[PDB]
Design a protein around this ligand. Sequence first.
Ligand SMILES: N[C@@H](CCC(=O)O)C(=O)O
Ligand code: NA
Ligand code: NA
Ligand code: NA
Ligand code: NA
Ligand code: NA
Length: 300
Amino acid sequence: RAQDFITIGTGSVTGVYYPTGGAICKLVNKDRKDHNIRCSVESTGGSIYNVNTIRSGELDFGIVQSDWQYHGYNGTSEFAEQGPYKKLRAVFSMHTEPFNIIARADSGIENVKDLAGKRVNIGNPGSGDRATMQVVMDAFGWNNDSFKLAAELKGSERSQALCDNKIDAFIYMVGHPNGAIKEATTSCAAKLVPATGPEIEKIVANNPYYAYSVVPAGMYSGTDQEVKSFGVAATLVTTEEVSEAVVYNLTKAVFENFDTFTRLHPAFANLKKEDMVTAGNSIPLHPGAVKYYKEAGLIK
Ligand SMILES: N[C@@H](CCC(=O)O)C(=O)O
Ligand code: NA
Ligand code: NA
Ligand code: NA
Ligand code: NA
Ligand code: NA
């Protein structure tokens, strides 16, 4: 854990986490001559890899879905074999990430229940995509054999596979707009498919980090009505092992430059400082973040 160099783990290069890490690092790096922190971004497999690799020491921060923030801390669900990681700390939360289904026009897939018996990219092993897909799979009584093909491509390979007719649909736990879904919809005629019904309703009712989501009509070519699903929040997490001064300066960089931050990616346009402190954060805030929030009056 260096005091003067930090690495943020994100996701595939055509998702939202990757440019989010870039935006955070830009706001840290602009004052590196003062606080001495150089911030670097890594593209990664996603939430699960990010938690595990903060733990093993190679990442200082990671962008992690609110459900895997909770389970990574507690050593539950996807993290059960790894055991608890009670040093994990929240920093702030960010944009909403719906459970998106992106299907071929000819796929016959009109809702989440239609994924069974199709070629479905359920997600790569390090991703929040695959881990939250397992939750959906649980709700339906599905296993990997419920699909004709349970493909595990990382995010930046999914649109090509869908358009090349190697899968009927891919799922993606991701904010909007993003490049992967823009490509599939605007260059290969894919559709965004809702996830509704009693199984999704149970998922939302039974968990505080799953809430109903809506993608508006016009977000993407060809999706001409709004699309309902459920969603999580993207969150920035770290470890107690990272120094309070480092987390303080990173948190201050984002919040004291909030009007700039919310101009850096269209997914950030409607963030609210107060919600960023609490929403989607179910584990202790890092003391360095708390220190800034108390200075700013966001925590009394
Ligand atoms: N939530 C996805 C990443 C989404 C993104 O890259 O923006 C994951 O944890 O795998
Ligand atoms: Na899992
Ligand atoms: Na809920
Ligand atoms: Na603004
Ligand atoms: Na507004
Ligand atoms: Na909270």
